[PDB]
Symmetry: none
Subunit: 110 residues, 4 copies
């Protein structure tokens, strides 16, 4: 299973696969292959629609297939315009809240 | 079990595969197979069944989202080569059995 | 015209009709069950039967089989006045089948 | 708009989060938790309860279905209570979550001072 292939399934959440896809595009991957089998095909669409709602990715290709019956979808997404700028502002905002929670937790303990 | 009703999608995929075949046979150059939310899976399997029967080829697949959000898939299928010959053979076998 | 929208409306009606026929055809209780993503439609099938005042829910259980597959099982029995309401639907379904048959022959023009 | 002991399973959260919320609410005094969902999320509410049943944490006290307006919207509601040995199995899960939190904090401060 390649690094740029995210398998959407029940051993995870839609929020986790969105985060993994964002991290893979930010961490060198030019394109991410978002795939799912059978009843999870809709959930793979929800993962990509969330990335599109956040204006982070653009869909490059969608294919359906049947593998060894089990049906399969595969959506290939690449970085959208302003991905780096919108990912780093979200990282800055997530660290600001992670430190403020730590600082107030330490202060509450003292 | 006579008193057990199993609710499922098997009779739904066969109906929509049949509907799609009839529209292609009745003049339509392309059929837009779409579904919302949890029905996206059945729409994909409906197209895979049509591809398995060598009836259609996928020309385009798009996804969209409307306002819980509602996700939508849209698969555009066209006639494959030898559709008429396989549609007439499927009709002959269904009329023979009826 | 060239757009096929795949959905569950009609499939819920088939199982609503099947459940009604099985209760009318001797069965005291019908077990309405479904797996995974069809659990929602199985619940809607029973809610449709409840609005028609045809069944009453006797028991609902959930279970898990080997990803894992979840299962619901709703046991419905006849409601009071089911026979009186089923006979009015059968009579009305026959009035329409004779009308469609007579219309088919009258369309010989 | 809902009571404290009512968990609404939906798209604003994961099944893992609703399982944890239900466990936390039962451990923090609540005698019963109402696990409910609407329409296409009804199956996901069933998976949340089945996960709690696999962990032998809850027992199902009641399941009801109903219909409300938005077309009509169908709803499931599962009432769960503590199973026997819930406290002993929840305390082992709490103990296991602190062990991993202290192992990560101790290791990440060790790595920062190498």
């Amino acid at each position: 299973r390649p690094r740029n292939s995210v398998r959407v399934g029940y051993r995870g959440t839609k929020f986790l696969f969105v985060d993994i896809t964002k991290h893979l595009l930010h961490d060198g991957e030019k394109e991410v292959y978002v795939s799912a089998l059978g009843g999870a095909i809709n959930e793979a669409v929800s993962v990509v629609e969330m990335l599109k709602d956040q204006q982070m990715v653009v869909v490059k290709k969608i294919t359906t297939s049947r593998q060894v019956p089990v049906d399969k979808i595969e959506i290939v997404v690449t970085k959208a315009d302003g991905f780096d700028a919108k990912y780093e502002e979200q990282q800055k905002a997530r660290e600001a809240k992670r430190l403020e929670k730590e600082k107030n937790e330490k202060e509450k303990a003292t």
